[PDB]
Structure formats: structure tokens, C-alpha cells
Design a binder for these strands. Structure first.
Length: 87
DNA sequence: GGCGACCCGGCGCCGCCTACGGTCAGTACTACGGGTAGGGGGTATCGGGCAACGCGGCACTGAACACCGTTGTCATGTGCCTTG
């Protein structure tokens, strides 16, 4: 029962291709640099800090895009490795 | 619109003790890295075997006194003989 609901929760999400995934990774590194700059104790402009924060949030969104995409692969591997004592 | 069915869920039960019962289940890997409980030797502290040194009864060096016992001792008193 619950696994059916989790597979439903996976539902339909956009699968990832080479161009989409590499663009997402580019946004990820952009956001990582943005939060790096934010974490620096040096004073930064307020609007600049908000720009860095929003790109970091967009990178987080990209992260969840990758994870929600590859839930299907990880459950495939789980099927490969299940039935040996753990749930 | 509340009844009504019906439909389903949902549970809940189905009686009391007694002898023994036979077994087995599939698809990573290396690699490092720390860090240890175990292997060692050497040292400080506590835990055993022979004498220790008390006591006590009495016992003796008997010594030195004490307790009767004794024959020492004797200046001093009766009895006979000689003279007033």
C-alpha cells in the first residue's frame, strides 16, 4: 500500500537529458558560488545579496529537479538489492 | 433531507486440560586509516614462615631473722658440824 502511494508521489516529473542536465549543473555551480560569496563576512550590497540568495534558491530547485528525476533509477537499484533482510 | 437500504467495514468469536514434534532459504569491491585490546618487562607494595618476649607458680641462694626448746650460769639460799 504505502509503496504505491510513494510511486504516485513520484508521479510524472520531467526526465533529464544532456543539455537540460548540464544547464542545471551550470546553475548549480552558479548558485554555489553565489552562496559562497554570501557567506563571506565582507560587506556586500543588499540587492546583490538578494540576487545571490535567489540564484542559490534556484540552484536548490535544480537540485530537487535532479533528485525527483532520478528517484526512478534509485528505486530500480533498490529492487536490484532488496530481499536480503532489509525492507 | 432524512430515511432507508445496502454495503461495506469491521471486529469479534468460535470449548477445557493432556503425550510427543523436525527442521533451512539465492546479486560487490577495494582501500585506507586510525586506533585499539592484546602481546610483551620491570617495579612497588602487600602477605607468608622462624623465633620473639613476655608471664606465674613456685621455688630456690637459703639469708636473715624470729619461736620455742634447752642445759648454760649462777650469786645466792637450806642443812650439818664445830665452837661460843
Amino acid at each position: 500500500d504505502p509503496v504505491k502511494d510513494y510511486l504516485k508521489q513520484i508521479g510524472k516529473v520531467p526526465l533529464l537529458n544532456a543539455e537540460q542536465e548540464v544547464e542545471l549543473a551550470k546553475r548549480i555551480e552558479a548558485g554555489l558560488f553565489a552562496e559562497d560569496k554570501l557567506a563571506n563576512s565582507d560587506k556586500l550590497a543588499p540587492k546583490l545579496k538578494r540576487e545571490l540568495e535567489i540564484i542559490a534558491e534556484d540552484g536548490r530547485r535544480a537540485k530537487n529537479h535532479l533528485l525527483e528525476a532520478n528517484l526512478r533509477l534509485v528505486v530500480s537499484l533498490a529492487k536490484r538489492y532488496t530481499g536480503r533482510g532489509m525492507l
